[PDB]
Every structure is written in C-alpha cells, then in structure tokens.
Amino acid sequence: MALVLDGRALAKQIEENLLVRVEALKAKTGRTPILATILVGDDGASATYVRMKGNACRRVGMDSLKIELPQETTTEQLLAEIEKLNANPDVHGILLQHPVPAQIDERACFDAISLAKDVDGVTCLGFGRMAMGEAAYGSATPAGIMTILKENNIEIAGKHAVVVGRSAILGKPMAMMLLQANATVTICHSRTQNLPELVKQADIIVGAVGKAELIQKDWIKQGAVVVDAGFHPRDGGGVGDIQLQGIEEIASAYTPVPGGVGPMTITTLIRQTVEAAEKALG
Amino acid sequence: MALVLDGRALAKQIEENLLVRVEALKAKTGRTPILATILVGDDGASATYVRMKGNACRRVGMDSLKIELPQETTTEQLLAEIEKLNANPDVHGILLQHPVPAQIDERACFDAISLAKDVDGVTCLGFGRMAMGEAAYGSATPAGIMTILKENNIEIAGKHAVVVGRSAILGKPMAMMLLQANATVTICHSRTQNLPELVKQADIIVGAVGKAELIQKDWIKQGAVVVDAGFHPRDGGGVGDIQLQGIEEIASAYTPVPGGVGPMTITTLIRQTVEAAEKALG
Ligand SMILES: Nc1nc(N)c(NC(=O)Nc2ccc(C(=O)N[C@@H](CCC(=O)O)C(=O)O)cc2)c(=O)[nH]1
Numbered sequence A, B: 001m002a003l004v005l006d007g008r009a010l011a012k013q014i015e016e017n018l019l020v021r022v023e024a025l026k027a028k029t030g031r032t033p034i035l036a037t038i039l040v041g042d043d044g045a046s047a048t049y050v051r052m053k054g055n056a057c058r059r060v061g062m063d064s065l066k067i068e069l070p071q072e073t074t075t076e077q078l079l080a081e082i083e084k085l086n087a088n089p090d091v092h093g094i095l096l097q098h099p100v101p102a103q104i105d106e107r108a109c110f111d112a113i114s115l116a117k118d119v120d121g122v123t124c125l126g127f128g129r130m131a132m133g134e135a136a137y138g139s140a141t142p143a144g145i146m147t148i149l150k151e152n153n154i155e156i157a158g159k160h161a162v163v164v165g166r167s168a169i170l171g172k173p174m175a176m177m178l179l180q181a182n183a184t185v186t187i188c189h190s191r192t193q194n195l196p197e198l199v200k201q202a203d204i205i206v207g208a209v210g211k212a213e214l215i216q217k218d219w220i221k222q223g224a225v226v227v228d229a230g231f232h233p234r235d236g237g238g239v240g241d242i243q244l245q246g247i248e249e250i251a252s253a254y255t256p257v258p259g260g261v262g263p264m265t266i267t268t269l270i271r272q273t274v275e276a277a278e279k280a281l282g
C-alpha cells in the first residue's frame, strides 16, 4: 500500500523549531516578525486561506498585518499599497493572495513586492533566480511539495516528473524546482494533446490544474509518486485534482487531500517569513 | 525531403530591415547605437563569436565597444566593468560572452547587466519575465530558434517539444519559450533515463547538449521538426549536437549545421540591440 505523504504531520514538526527561532529573535531584538497579508475583494476561499496563514504566523510567535481591500480596487491602488509595505520596516514579508479581482494586473502587483519581502515567492525575479540556482524564496506550494518529497526520502534524480498545469505560482515553479532536483520534467497544460499517455509515463505526477479529479486514476503508473495540489470543497470531504479513491493500490507514495500539499503551502510561507525576519532584524 | 530551415537567409533578411532602421535613427539623433561586447580571457571560439557579433553590428550600421579583459579578471573587476557600461548612456546593449574564466561568478555578472541593456537575454530577471509572459529581451539563441520556427510556419501549439540540455542561456529559456508557444515541453539533461525513448516521442527536438552528434538519427520521430543548436568544428565541415546525416529522409523540417541556428543567434542579439537603441534614443 502507498506511503501517505503526511503534510499535516510535517507542518506540525516544522513549526516546532520555527517557534524556537522566532522566540529567540524576539528575545534578542525586542521586535516581532510581521507578515503583511493582502486580501483583495470577496473570494471566500482567499479569505479562508489568508486567515489560515495568519493563524500559522501566530502559532510560531509572529503576527500578521491584515490588509483588506475592496473588490473594485485598481492596479494602481494595489501597487501603491504594496509600495507602502515595501518601505515599512515593521513588515518583513508580503503576501498577495491569488486570485485578485480580474481588473487588476496581478503579475504587475506580484512584481512590485520587494525581493527581500517576497516570502510567498511570486516575483518574476524570484522565479528566475530559483530557476538558475540562485538563492530565493520559492513559491510556497511547490517549495512545500519539494520539502514533502525530501523529508519522505522520495527519489527525484533521474525520475520522469510530469507536471500537469503551468500557472505562474504553481506549475511553472514546480517544474523548475523538480528540474533543479534532477528529474526529467514534462510540463503539460490545456493544449497538451495526449495527456493520459504522458501521465502514464510519470514516475512523479503533480496535479496542478484546479479541476476536480481531472487526472484519472487509470492514467497513473504503478509505483508512481502522486502529488495532488488541488482542493475542491464537497459534502463530507473535499477532493483534489487527481482521482485518489483506490490510489493506495497504485502509488508508491501519495499526498492525501486534505492534509497533504495544503498544510505545507502554509508552512513554507511561514518558514520563509521567519527567514526574512531573521535577516532583517538579526 | 525535409524543409531546410534557412537561418542564414532569414538573418540576412532581418539585417536589411535593421540597417534602414539604424540609419533612420542616426539621421534623426546624430548618434550611433552601441553594443558593448565583453570578452574575458583567451578562449578561441569566444573570440570568434564576439568578432562575428561586432561584424553584424557594423553590417546594420551600428558599432561595438570592444571590452577585452584578461584571463585573471575577478568577479569584482567584471562587475565594476559592467556597472560602468550600465551607467554609460551611449551604450545601449551589453554582451558578456560565455563562458568566462571559471574563477568568475558568471551568474552574478550576467545579473549585474541592467534589464534595459540585457540585449542577449542573460539576466535572471529577463528569464523570469519572459517565462511569465512579460516584456524582456530573450536569450539570443533560443529566441532566434523561435523566430526560425515562426517565420517557417512551423506548428508549435499542441506539439510535444523535447529540449535536450538545460543550460542557463540555452536549454532553460528554449523550454520556457516553447511552453509560451503552447508546446507540451519535456526538458532532458545528463541525468535523464530512457533519453532515446523520450526523443522518439518528440514532434520538435532541440539539441542543446554541446556534444558532437550525441542525439542519434534513429532516435528521431519520422516527420519531426529537428533543431540543432550545436557547433563543433571539423575538417571537411563542422557538425552539431544531432546526427544530421540523411536527416532529409526523416525530418519534416530541420536546421542545417552550419547556417541554421548560428546566424539567427547573432541576428537576434543585434535586433534586440537595435530595439534598445530605438527606445533609448526616441
Ligand atoms: N499568493 C498565493 N495565492 C494563493 N492562492 C495561494 N494558494 C493557497 O493559499 N492555497 C492553499 C490551498 C489549500 C490550503 C489548505 O491548507 N487546505 C487544507 C484544506 C482546508 C480547507 O481548504 O478548508 C488542506 O489541504 O489540508 C492552503 C493554501 C498561495 O499559496 N499563494
């Protein structure tokens, strides 16, 4: 039966020393690390995830600066708001929760965040530096996945990884991180013409499509490592981007949904905020 | 027989347009566009390609500022030279010819070049922006390849492109550019297993390994589009990274070596320098 890649347990374990580090920094400097979170508009899921990230901050002795902007916020207004936070020495990391209202140029706003405070890893600069092996905060969800794979001793070098999805904050960074770990990487998307065929070749499959159980269980290679980065609420248990019912007979290891990639998205953001604060204050 | 993707003809065609644009610019402003070329050490191929790039500048009515630094140059010394060029308003583009002597942090020096003068497309920032669909000068060789494919009406969207090699200035940007053009993209490298099988699945193959004829002709899918980005001087005619002997029987279209990717590497650099000059002097 497949090894459950327990993101919930890993997140809990990691938070233990993050709390020690933060309490050390606060005792040393007399200053509390701050993650500024920006929630723009009325997306309920975005609201929920921002609160979860704030809670996680407080669990390790940090706090959040809660920035909430209306649905009709313009690109110019959000940029100004990010420039305030960039020049705020009391703020050590900046999160802009995706997806912002459609009228806003999200890419422009991501890129306005200073590299030093890009603790969610959304800037083009952060991405390019990561892709080229230079030190950078990685996009939270894919960096969290690499941590899951590494802590669970999952072999990556020489494996064929297939990433289904190519979004700026998930699929693309995921692909580059796996490449950096010496996987052969295939990147698929909505214009891939033979998706089932390619998924069946995957030693490591990452579902990053944001569509409930799009990736069929029948496409999964026997002994594959299965990573499901999706989450879709449903009556009595949500589902991810991959059909996981009966995956225990197929995968060598898999991320459950919930309790897999999700907690480690949050933990990665928090860890990288701790890192930023240490650099800023220490 | 296969379509010859004639990079030499395309380069000449592009240069005719660049010439009239440069002459118009000089007529309007009285100033000549300048590419600063930085050659560090005594590598023969590097000297040759920098000479060819300077020749191309003058063919289209521009000139080059030839910077030649010794073998023992330090990272700090090279950074200082690049910062002088960044601050010089008469210099519109900066080329650092790779590979610099190994004691130099080449990545750090690439990244010191201002985005506005990154006409060879070597910055992390430029790579990141291109990968995310934002405006930036593209790495010369892979951008030249995209142009070859486009201007020969080669179908890319929905095709499986396999890039063999993942270098910072070739393989990685090549893959991100093909992905932006809606190809399914597989990135291979020295740790890749079952390489012959992965190449056989490819609708578009890009050889970027810097090893003479590594990619074997029987690995190529019948009807594939074959792009060879290698060059290795040999008595009686140089060869690339792909066995191209009898390629006309196998490929639907192929870049010859020499006279394919090479000329378009040079012309892409010059075109992007003209663009930089047009912006700066307008
Ligand atoms: N900037 C930015 N925007 C984004 N939209 C994200 N994604 C971004 O927050 N995703 C996310 C998804 C699931 C969970 C999570 O922990 N989910 C729980 C399920 C609980 C629930 O969703 O009610 C789980 O999977 O265990 C946390 C974050 C991000 O990481 N950064």
Ligand SMILES: Nc1nc(N)c(NC(=O)Nc2ccc(C(=O)N[C@@H](CCC(=O)O)C(=O)O)cc2)c(=O)[nH]1
Pocket: B049, B052, B095, B096, B097, B098, B099, B120, B122, B140, B141, B169, B231, B238, B257, B258, B259, B260, B261, B262, B263, B265, B266
């Ligand atoms: N920064 C930087 N460093 C680099 N090292 C390169 N590569 C970088 O100049 N390559 C290159 C390779 C071949 C040719 C070329 O035109 N080759 C001819 C052959 C010339 C001959 O036969 O002597 C051809 O393929 O037709 C031009 C540039 C680059 O583009 N940028």
Ligand SMILES: [Cl-]
Pocket: A055, A056, A059
């Ligand atoms: Cl809590």
